[PDB]
Amino acid sequence: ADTIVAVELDTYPNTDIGDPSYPHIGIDIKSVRSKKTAKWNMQNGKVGTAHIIYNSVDKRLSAVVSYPNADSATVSYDVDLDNVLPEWVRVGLSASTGLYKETNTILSWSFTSKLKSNTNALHFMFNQFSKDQKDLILQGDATTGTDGNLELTRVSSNGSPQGSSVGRALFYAPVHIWESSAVVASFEATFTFLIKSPDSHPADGIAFFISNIDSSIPSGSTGRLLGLFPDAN
Amino acid sequence: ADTIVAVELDTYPNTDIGDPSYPHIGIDIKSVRSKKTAKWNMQNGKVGTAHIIYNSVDKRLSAVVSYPNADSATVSYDVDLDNVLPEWVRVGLSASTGLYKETNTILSWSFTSKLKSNTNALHFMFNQFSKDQKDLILQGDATTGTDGNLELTRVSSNGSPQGSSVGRALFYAPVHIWESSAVVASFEATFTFLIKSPDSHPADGIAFFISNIDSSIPSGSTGRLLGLFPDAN
Amino acid sequence: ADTIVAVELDTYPNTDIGDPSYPHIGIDIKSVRSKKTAKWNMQNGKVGTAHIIYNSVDKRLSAVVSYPNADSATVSYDVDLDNVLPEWVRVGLSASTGLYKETNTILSWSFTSKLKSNTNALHFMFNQFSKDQKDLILQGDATTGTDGNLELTRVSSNGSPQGSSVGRALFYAPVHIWESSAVVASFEATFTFLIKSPDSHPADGIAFFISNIDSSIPSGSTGRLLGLFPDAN
Amino acid sequence: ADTIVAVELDTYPNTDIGDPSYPHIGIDIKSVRSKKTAKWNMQNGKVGTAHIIYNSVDKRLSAVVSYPNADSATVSYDVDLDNVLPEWVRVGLSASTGLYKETNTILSWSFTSKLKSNTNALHFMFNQFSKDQKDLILQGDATTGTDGNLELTRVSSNGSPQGSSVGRALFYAPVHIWESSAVVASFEATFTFLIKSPDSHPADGIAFFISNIDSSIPSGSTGRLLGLFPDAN
Numbered sequence: 001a002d003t004i005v006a007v008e009l010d011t012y013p014n015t016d017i018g019d020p021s022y023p024h025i026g027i028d029i030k031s032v033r034s035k036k037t038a039k040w041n042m043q044n045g046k047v048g049t050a051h052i053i054y055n056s057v058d059k060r061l062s063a064v065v066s067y068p069n070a071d072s073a074t075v076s077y078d079v080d081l082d083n084v085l086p087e088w089v090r091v092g093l094s095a096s097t098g099l100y101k102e103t104n105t106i107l108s109w110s111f112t113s114k115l116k117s118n119t120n121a122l123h124f125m126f127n128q129f130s131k132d133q134k135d136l137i138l139q140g141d142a143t144t145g146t147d148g149n150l151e152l153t154r155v156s157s158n159g160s161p162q163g164s165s166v167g168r169a170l171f172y173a174p175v176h177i178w179e180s181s182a183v184v185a186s187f188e189a190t191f192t193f194l195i196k197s198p199d200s201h202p203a204d205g206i207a208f209f210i211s212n213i214d215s216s217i218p219s220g221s222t223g224r225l226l227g228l229f230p231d232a233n
Numbered sequence: 234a235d236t237i238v239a240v241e242l243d244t245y246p247n248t249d250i251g252d253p254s255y256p257h258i259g260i261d262i263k264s265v266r267s268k269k270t271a272k273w274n275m276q277n278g279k280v281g282t283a284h285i286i287y288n289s290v291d292k293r294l295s296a297v298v299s300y301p302n303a304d305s306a307t308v309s310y311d312v313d314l315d316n317v318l319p320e321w322v323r324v325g326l327s328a329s330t331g332l333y334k335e336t337n338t339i340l341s342w343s344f345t346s347k348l349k350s351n352t353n354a355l356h357f358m359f360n361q362f363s364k365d366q367k368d369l370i371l372q373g374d375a376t377t378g379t380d381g382n383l384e385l386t387r388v389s390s391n392g393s394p395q396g397s398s399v400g401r402a403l404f405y406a407p408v409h410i411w412e413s414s415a416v417v418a419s420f421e422a423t424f425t426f427l428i429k430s431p432d433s434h435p436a437d438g439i440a441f442f443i444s445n446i447d448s449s450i451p452s453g454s455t456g457r458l459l460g461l462f463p464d465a466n
Numbered sequence: 467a468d469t470i471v472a473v474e475l476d477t478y479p480n481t482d483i484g485d486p487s488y489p490h491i492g493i494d495i496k497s498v499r500s501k502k503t504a505k506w507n508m509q510n511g512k513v514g515t516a517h518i519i520y521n522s523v524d525k526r527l528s529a530v531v532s533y534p535n536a537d538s539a540t541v542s543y544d545v546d547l548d549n550v551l552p553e554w555v556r557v558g559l560s561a562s563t564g565l566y567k568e569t570n571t572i573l574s575w576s577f578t579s580k581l582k583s584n585t586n587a588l589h590f591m592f593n594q595f596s597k598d599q600k601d602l603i604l605q606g607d608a609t610t611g612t613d614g615n616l617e618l619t620r621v622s623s624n625g626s627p628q629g630s631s632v633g634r635a636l637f638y639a640p641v642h643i644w645e646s647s648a649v650v651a652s653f654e655a656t657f658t659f660l661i662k663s664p665d666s667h668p669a670d671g672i673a674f675f676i677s678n679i680d681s682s683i684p685s686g687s688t689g690r691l692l693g694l695f696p697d698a699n
Numbered sequence: 700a701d702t703i704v705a706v707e708l709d710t711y712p713n714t715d716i717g718d719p720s721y722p723h724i725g726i727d728i729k730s731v732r733s734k735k736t737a738k739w740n741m742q743n744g745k746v747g748t749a750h751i752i753y754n755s756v757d758k759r760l761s762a763v764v765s766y767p768n769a770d771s772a773t774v775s776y777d778v779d780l781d782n783v784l785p786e787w788v789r790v791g792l793s794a795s796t797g798l799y800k801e802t803n804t805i806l807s808w809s810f811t812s813k814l815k816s817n818t819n820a821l822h823f824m825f826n827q828f829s830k831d832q833k834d835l836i837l838q839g840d841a842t843t844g845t846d847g848n849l850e851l852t853r854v855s856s857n858g859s860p861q862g863s864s865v866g867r868a869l870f871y872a873p874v875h876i877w878e879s880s881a882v883v884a885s886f887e888a889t890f891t892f893l894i895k896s897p898d899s900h901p902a903d904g905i906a907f908f909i910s911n912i913d914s915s916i917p918s919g920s921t922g923r924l925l926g927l928f929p930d931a932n
């Protein structure tokens with residue numbers, strides 16, 4: 001199967017598969033059952049911001065999520081990504097809905113990776129998404145262009161989110177995260193999102209993920225599986 | 234045919250097709266016959282540096298080439314790239330040899346493009362090239378990995394350059410150079426090169442080019458055609 | 467006196483000193499009488515954005531100003547800044563009011579300068595201004611901290627702008643814009659502004675300027691002189 | 700006294716004050732007695748490179764030093780810099796010699812700091828130092844301009860290093876490392892150095908440091924005190 005490393009923004013508590021009894025952020029290593037979670041005070045209809053950072057010296061994957069005029073939520077986990085991911089990877093965003101639903105809108109997205117030997121770099125930034133974004137790989141129900149935004153999951157014309165939807169968006173160019181002569185390897189990611197729902201129980205969430213370059217959406221990965229994992233193991 | 238906009242580092246004077254009677258730098262717009270040239274004091278076996286800049290406000294393509302401890306050579310040309318190139322393009326480097334030969338080695342390469350609306354950006358930088366550079370499209374005789382360098386044209390094991398060779402290297406991800414809401418569009422490119430030859434008459438040169446995303450090497454474009462143009466029209 | 471190179475956002479037409487009969491943007495070279503102007507459709511109470519660019523190869527100072535959902539205004543002028551400005555300079559923002567008044571609020575400010583020899587760089591970015599901005603030199607009535615913004619001219623507690631006011635803000639560190647070994651020198655500036663006024667005739671405007679490191683506000687430079695020039699010569 | 704946080708490149712083992720019995724790199728927190736050290740295979744007359752990184756989420760100060768064609772040395776230490784340093788600081792480089800001596804030459808220096816709230820940034824880069832570097836504060840015997848390099852300690856005309864010397868170089872503009880609304884604060888530093896000595900026992904070393912904005916060289920801080928600390932407590 002695919003190799004997945006992801007930071008999940010989980011809006012629906014599936015307590016039967018390890019989720020806490022509240023909206024949360026988590027670090028997923030090849031499993032939907034997070035290795036580490038933190039309580040997330042999610043706000044319906046508000047624009048949020050997420051930061052993800054990592055470097056090969058400290059070997060620590062940390063993430064910070066916040067809303068304007070509010071306190072932030074953070075979570076960290078010690079993991080050597082060189083022992084999990086291949087040398088060449090692709091980065092992207094994923095989201096899903098099930099019987100419960102929500103809008104999974106992305107307003108902006110930036111990413112930067114550095115390889116310092118004894119310096120190679122890649123940086124891209126989207127502040128608006130065009131109708132034909134040729135430097136993005138869209139999978140599933142993901143579409144671009146609507147109000148210059150990226151809609152990961154299906155949304156009707158009236159602006160109402162649909163259930164049983166799943167979509168992913170990956171950057172076109174592969175990313176080099178390890179090299180034999182490298183002394184320091186690091187990356188940082190930032191994206192702004194807008195989750196809206198007419199229901200009192202939104203679902204299922206958004207995730208930033210890193211995977212093998214030929215990764216595709218697993219079958220039946222709608223709902224709680226966030227379009228990343230084939231099962232709940 | 235392909236749409237080509239290139240800055241040529243011409244080492245061999247082909248006076249029958251418009252070249253001046255000396256090594257030169259030039260601006261090529263859909264033709265090997267440069268719209269504008271400048272005298273270039275090329276140095277055999279020395280590492281040089283080239284800078285290329287452009288923005289949509291001034292609509293001026295300028296280039297600067299220099300060696301350490303020496304005076305620089307520069308050339309500019311007024312041209313609206315929006316009236317020549319498509320909305321989505323690819324960028325890359327090209328080189329060739331004919332009956333006369335030279336080494337076309339690339340030591341480093343950086344590129345940055347900006348789209349500011351009423352900001353989207355792409356930046357990559359190579360200071361060393363690996364054996365399997367997955368984020369590069371290699372065409373022709375171009376190879377990577379040899380001493381961490383990029384060899385555009387064929388070079389034997391003893392380090393001797395071969396004749397009748399041609400090779401190009403393009404960045405994997407397409408580049409967005411125009412948008413309907415953009416108020417300012419700009420890009421800058423920089424690469425370091427090493428041209429070596431045991432002969433008194435090296436040939437044929439190196440070029441940085443911009444083209445349609447599906448561009449490939451034209452037939453019989455070795456030698457004076459720099460692997461960019463099908464003929465000398 | 468001081469050496470001033472500035473891009474003016476002129477909101478009040480002083481036709482007796484060369485101004486066109488409408489709000490305009492202009493390039494000022496050691497004089498308030500602009501060398502080049504362009505019509506500016508200024509919008510009261512709306513957030514605008516200004517871009518300024520220059521490089522030593524083309525020797526062209528260009529500026530672009532725009533509002534959301536509207537067409538932009540642009541102006542360019544050919545000038546060798548090496549023949550006008552000293553080797554070391556300071557950059558900053560200036561504004562003024564006279565008998566007519568307006569708010570001169572700055573929401574963000576970014577600047578980048580590059581010196582490439584045969585590479586030295588400086589970059590700073592403000593997206594919010596703190597109460598004690600130690601890396602800024604405040605002159606006149608300029609204050610920081612109010613709603614995280616930079617107020618160049620005097621504004622009362624109720625949010626009403628005051629007349630006969632003048633204020634400037636300069637970056638603390640000097641900027642190197644020329645070097646003997648430099649082959650390419652360039653800079654770009656961007657700032658967002660908010661001009662509000664209860665009157666039908668706002669005044670007097672905002673300007674981005676470059677000057678000698680020890681520049682201060684000239685006496686009686688309120689109103690039409692934009693806090694940059696001692697007289698209207 | 701001054702508040703000092705520094706990463707030392709210690710070339711001379713002063714075992715009576717806590718040094719290991721070999722050249723080493725260390726993390727100094729308000730004391731010359733390092734909180735954490737690592738063995739450093741220093742090479743006389745070779746150009747080295749040092750990387751220093753930190754962020755407010757992980758609260759971990761890590762450093763990596765390496766030479767070409769050789770294995771690297773690294774050291775990390777958990778410390779909350781918000782509980783040690785003031786809100787506004789200055790960054791710089793320091794070096795010293797005693798009865799034993801060495802050249803403390805700096806070839807390049809880059810620094811980047813980020814403040815992300817619920818983004819402010821500062822970045823500068825020196826690849827060559829001019830005779831009159833107005834954006835640097837030179838203290839002690841530090842001079843700029845010699846072969847475009849920065850000589851922290853005294854060197855005679857013949858290129859021979861002098862004993863009992865001390866010099867520091869700080870960036871002119873203050874740096875903001877903490878803010879009440881900040882959710883993520885980080886910085887990274889990189890500099891290349893050349894340590895040469897005709898002796899078999901070079902001394903005393905080079906250090907990158909962070910301090911209060913009004914920091915100056917302590918009396919009698921030559922030799923083992925690296926020009927940072929008043930005593931060996």
Ligand SMILES: [Ca+2]
Nearest residue numbers: 010012013014
């Ligand atoms: Ca869940």
Ligand SMILES: [Ca+2]
Nearest residue numbers: 243245246247
């Ligand atoms: Ca030719």
Ligand SMILES: [Ca+2]
Nearest residue numbers: 476478479480
């Ligand atoms: Ca006026």
Ligand SMILES: [Ca+2]
Nearest residue numbers: 709711712713
């Ligand atoms: Ca010591």
Ligand SMILES: [Mg+2]
Nearest residue numbers: 010019026034
């Ligand atoms: Mg979960």
Ligand SMILES: [Mg+2]
Nearest residue numbers: 243252259267
């Ligand atoms: Mg030619």
Ligand SMILES: [Mg+2]
Nearest residue numbers: 476485492500
């Ligand atoms: Mg005017």
Ligand SMILES: [Mg+2]
Nearest residue numbers: 709718725733
């Ligand atoms: Mg020590």
